[PDB]
Amino acid sequence: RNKIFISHATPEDDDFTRWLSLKLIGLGYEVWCDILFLDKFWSTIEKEIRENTCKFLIVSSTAGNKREGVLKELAVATKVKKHLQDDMFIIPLAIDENLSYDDINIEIVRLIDFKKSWAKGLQDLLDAFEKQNVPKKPPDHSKSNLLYQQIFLHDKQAIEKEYDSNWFPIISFPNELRFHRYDWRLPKQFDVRTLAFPAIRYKEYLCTFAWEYDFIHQLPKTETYNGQESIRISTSDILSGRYDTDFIRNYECQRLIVQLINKAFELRMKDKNVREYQMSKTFAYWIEKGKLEKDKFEKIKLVGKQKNKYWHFGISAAGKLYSPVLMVSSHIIFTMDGINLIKSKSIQHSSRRKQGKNWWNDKWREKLLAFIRFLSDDQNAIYLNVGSEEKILISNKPLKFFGKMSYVTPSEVTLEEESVLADINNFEE
Amino acid sequence: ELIYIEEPSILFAHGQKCTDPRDGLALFGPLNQIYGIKSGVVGTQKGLQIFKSYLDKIQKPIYNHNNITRPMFPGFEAVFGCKWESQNIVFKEITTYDLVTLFNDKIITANKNDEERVDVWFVIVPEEIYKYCFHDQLKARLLEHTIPTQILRESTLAWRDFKNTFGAPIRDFSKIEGHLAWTISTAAYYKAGGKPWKLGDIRPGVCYLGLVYKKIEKSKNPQNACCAAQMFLDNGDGTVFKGEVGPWYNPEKGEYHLKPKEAKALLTQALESYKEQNKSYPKEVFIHARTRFNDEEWNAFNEVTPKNTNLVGVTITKSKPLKLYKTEGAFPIMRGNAYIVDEKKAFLWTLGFVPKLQSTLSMEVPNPIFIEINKGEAEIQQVLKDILALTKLNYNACIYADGEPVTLRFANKIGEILTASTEIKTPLAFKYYI
RNA sequence: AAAC
Ligand SMILES: [Mg+2]
Numbered sequence: 130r131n132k133i134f135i136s137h138a139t140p141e142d143d144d145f146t147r148w149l150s151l152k153l154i155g156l157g158y159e160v161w162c163d164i165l166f167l168d169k170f171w172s173t174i175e176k177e178i179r180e181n182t183c184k185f186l187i188v189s190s191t192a193g194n195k196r197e198g199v200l201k202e203l204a205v206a207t208k209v210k211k212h213l214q215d216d217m218f219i220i221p222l223a224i225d226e227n228l229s230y231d232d233i234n235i236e237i238v239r240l241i242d243f244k245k246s247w248a249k250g251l252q253d254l255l256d257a258f259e260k261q262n263v264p265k266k267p268p269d270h271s272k273s274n275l276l277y278q279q280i281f282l283h284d285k286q287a288i289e290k291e292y293d294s295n296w297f298p299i300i301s302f303p304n305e306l307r308f309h310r311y312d313w314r315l316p317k318q319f320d321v322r323t324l325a326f327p328a329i330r331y332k333e334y335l336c337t338f339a340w341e342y343d344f345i346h347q348l349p350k351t352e353t354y355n356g357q358e359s360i361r362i363s364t365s366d367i368l369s370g371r372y373d374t375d376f377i378r379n380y381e382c383q384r385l386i387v388q389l390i391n392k393a394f395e396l397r398m399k400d401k402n403v404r405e406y407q408m409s410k411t412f413a414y415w416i417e418k419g420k421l422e423k424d425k426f427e428k429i430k431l432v433g434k435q436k437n438k439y440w441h442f443g444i445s446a447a448g449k450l451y452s453p454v455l456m457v458s459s460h461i462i463f464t465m466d467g468i469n470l471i472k473s474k475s476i477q478h479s480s481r482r483k484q485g486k487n488w489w490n491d492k493w494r495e496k497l498l499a500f501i502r503f504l505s506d507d508q509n510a511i512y513l514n515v516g517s518e519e520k521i522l523i524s525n526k527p528l529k530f531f532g533k534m535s536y537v538t539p540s541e542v543t544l545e546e547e548s549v550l551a552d553i554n555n556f557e558e
Numbered sequence: 559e560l561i562y563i564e565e566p567s568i569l570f571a572h573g574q575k576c577t578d579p580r581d582g583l584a585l586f587g588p589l590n591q592i593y594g595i596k597s598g599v600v601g602t603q604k605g606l607q608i609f610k611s612y613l614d615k616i617q618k619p620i621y622n623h624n625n626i627t628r629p630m631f632p633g634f635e636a637v638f639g640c641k642w643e644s645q646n647i648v649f650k651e652i653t654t655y656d657l658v659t660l661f662n663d664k665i666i667t668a669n670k671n672d673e674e675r676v677d678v679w680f681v682i683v684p685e686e687i688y689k690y691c692f693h694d695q696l697k698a699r700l701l702e703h704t705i706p707t708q709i710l711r712e713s714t715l716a717w718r719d720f721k722n723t724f725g726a727p728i729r730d731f732s733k734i735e736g737h738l739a740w741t742i743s744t745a746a747y748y749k750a751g752g753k754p755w756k757l758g759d760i761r762p763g764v765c766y767l768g769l770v771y772k773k774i775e776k777s778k779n780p781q782n783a784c785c786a787a788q789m790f791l792d793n794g795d796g797t798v799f800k801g802e803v804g805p806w807y808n809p810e811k812g813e814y815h816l817k818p819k820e821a822k823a824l825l826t827q828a829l830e831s832y833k834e835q836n837k838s839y840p841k842e843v844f845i846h847a848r849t850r851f852n853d854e855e856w857n858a859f860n861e862v863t864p865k866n867t868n869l870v871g872v873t874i875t876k877s878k879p880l881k882l883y884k885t886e887g888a889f890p891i892m893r894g895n896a897y898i899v900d901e902k903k904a905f906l907w908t909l910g911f912v913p914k915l916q917s918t919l920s921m922e923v924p925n926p927i928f929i930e931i932n933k934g935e936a937e938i939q940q941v942l943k944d945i946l947a948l949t950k951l952n953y954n955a956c957i958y959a960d961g962e963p964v965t966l967r968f969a970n971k972i973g974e975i976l977t978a979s980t981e982i983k984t985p986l987a988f989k990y991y992i
Numbered sequence: 993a994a995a996c
Contacts, residue, residue, distance in 0.1 A: 282914065285913045296880060485921065490888050493923050536892050541888065693993045739994085742995090
């Protein structure tokens with residue numbers, strides 16, 4: 130009547146069938162193809178060919194040459210062609226180059242090719258359609274787009290269904306931030322980084338969370354300390370922003386707390402039984418081979434093997450106070466026999482970019498969380514030493530986020546395709 | 559509490575809004591159609607035959623090992639609607655400074671002597687040249703003449719023929735040969751005056767600006783840094799303005815900033831280009847950079863900007879990781895989810911899993927771009943939508959979307975090109991850099 | 993110097 134029926138090999142020729150079908154509904158044709166519906170059937174298919182279909186096409190490819198479905202479509206279409214005495218009711222669409230002559234279905238060899246290019250084939254098909262009195266509507270690509278979204282993007286949408294960060298909250302802070310002042314200026318060669326406790330040389334003051342007696346036995350004997358000139362600020366209003374003096378401003382308060390937290394973490398990783406690594410910016414902190422139980426912790430691996438190198442899942446940390454949290458960045462640092470670091474950083478980066486593949490959301494999340502739990506003091510907290518009595522408490526469970534949209538979790542074999550193909554591609558890179 | 563932004567829809571031909579540029583290109587075709595592609599070839603005779611073989615391959619459809627994440631290549635004429643033959647190929651035989659010198663000499667002599675104009679030029683680089691040395695230098699030297707050029711190697715189109723001592727190919731395209739042809743064809747169509755796609759859900763009269771800074775190592779002054787800007791409306795076809803070479807980089811601070819005597823110049827260039835291309839002044843202007851601007855730059859920007867324009871400055875950073883993890887599954891957080899830190903700071907997940915591809919743009923875990931409205935006043939969700947849209951307009955690669963918005967993606971490459979030649983002054987579209 |  131008016132429809133344009135396409136028959137094809139469903140699994141192997143769905144690319145060309147998709148392309149041709151969508152292009153044909155784009156041009157206003159009333160196209161009928163087996164892939165243009167969801168939750169479909171032979172009673173309906175045969176009904177369209179017998180009465181509704183005005184033109185019928187087959188995809189003459191090697192894969193679809195001998196297919197029960199397409200052959201039975203060809204049979205019913207031959208019946209309709211005999212009924213309608215149309216010399217070109219059924220039209221081959223040869224898209225396969227390997228399909229040699231005298232190998233096509235006998236009902237087809239005696240009768241448009243896409244082997245050279247689908248554009249040339251589509252033009253030939255369009256002029257063949259125009260030569261016959263093929264009914265059509267004005268070109269409406271809007272309905273073609275609607276069909277593309279409704280059929281081919283139905284499983285590729287986003288659910289309205291209701292995330293573990295690397296941002297670990299700081300539930301409690303030491304109540305006061307203290308600046309120490311001494312009668313004599315500390316020597317310039319005296320490095321505050323060598324101080325056993327976090328301390329920032331701010332102006333002539335020393336910025337700490339700590340007390341005076343913590344470093345009483347490491348400061349030079351030529352320095353005399355006075356307890357009167359130390360100034361304390363209430364930390365709760367430091368976060369609340371209510372603090373305002375000319376000596377120190379809130380924007381500097383939070384930044385000072387940031388480097389205090391960073392140094393506290395760096396010093397804590399000396400008593401946390403963790404080895405160190407030199408990178409461009411900061412200290413990487415990894416777990417040595419031979420220390421962790423079978424290189425696992427709560428049944429998450431943290432250390433492993435890569436060719437003759439050994440990878441160790443290390444971390445670095447950085448505080449922030451906008452909500453007070455700490456971010457942990459995950460690095461992978463290699464050693465050559467589990468003990469000796471690789472001298473040259475180029476192999477380190479190349480090996481890291483090789484190793485990062487095969488690791489995805491759950492693996493990265495579990496490895497970072499395992500390292501954090503390994504760094505915890507309490508079950509649900511991490512204690513950073515800032516003072517002999519003052520401690521910084523950072524919850525070892527990262528921040529939780531209430532989402533509202535997500536995807537239908539697809540087959541993991543698709544992600545395995547991603548893993549293998551992208552792994553090969555990055556090897557090429 | 560995350561928020562989600564519906565993925566930006568981009569137009570293609572026939573006024574149809576799709577989401578994947580490859581899907582729209584294969585469905586509706588390019589938004590702006592060109593009658594054809596006239597291609598120019600410069601290289602050795604073996605390079606010529608390799609290029610001819612690769613067009614013979616391009617004419618026929620090429621398939622990917624995964625046709626959902628990387629949709630198949632219908633064939634150039636099937637998707638684009640314009641032919642790229644071997645008869646439209648003009649070849650000039652060739653039998654670090656000297657090599658690019660000969661190549662540029664051939665290109666200029668061809669562009670001058672040949673009567674018939676050529677839409678794009680394609681340069682075949684032998685493997686020895688790649689191993690012993692070019693793209694930035696050559697493509698910069700051709701900036702004066704406004705010659706859109708695409709560079710390919712001998713081992714890129716004929717990778718199967720080139721094999722190592724073990725007999726394996728140097729680099730394997732078997733699984734993504736269709737994707738490689740997709741990208742090459744999209745680049746060639748972009749450089750031929752055709753605009754493959756443009757954003758659809760976008761407000762009228764909005765411009766997006768991106769500043770780029772590149773240091774000069776050969777300069778005696780260690781502080782020197784050239785500047786540049788990139789401008790996009792919604793087309794993704796951006797105009798690039800070269801800045802001034804001089805003391806830009808802040809060495810102790812590690813930042814890049816403009817004195818007010820060049821920020822005015824750059825933004826005035828951007829606004830005059832807008833007025834030429836639109837005949838009106840934009841209602842909003844967004845400036846993008848990897849670093850926050852000092853108040854000097856912002857005031858210099860504000861003086862040259864008209865009163866009715868709500869100038870906004872937004873910085874995009876790959877800062878310290880807020881790497882979200884979905885609780886269940888190895889599938890990362892989907893691309894397009896945003897965290898509203900505050901009305902001026904937000905996180906945008908331009909990478910990660912996308913339902914349309916059932917795949918991930920990011921490799922390991924999507925590191926979000928921290929976007930900050932450091933200057934100006936604008937609604938944060940609108941800025942996130944604009945950056946999400948701008949992530950789609952990378953014409954140099956035929957991919958679903960880009961991790962970095964196009965206003966900042968090619969910062970390093972355009973900087974390398976601009977600083978490759980120091981004695982060259984340039985007015986130009988993005989197609990003369992990518 | 994297909995490309996991120
Ligand atoms: Mg390019």
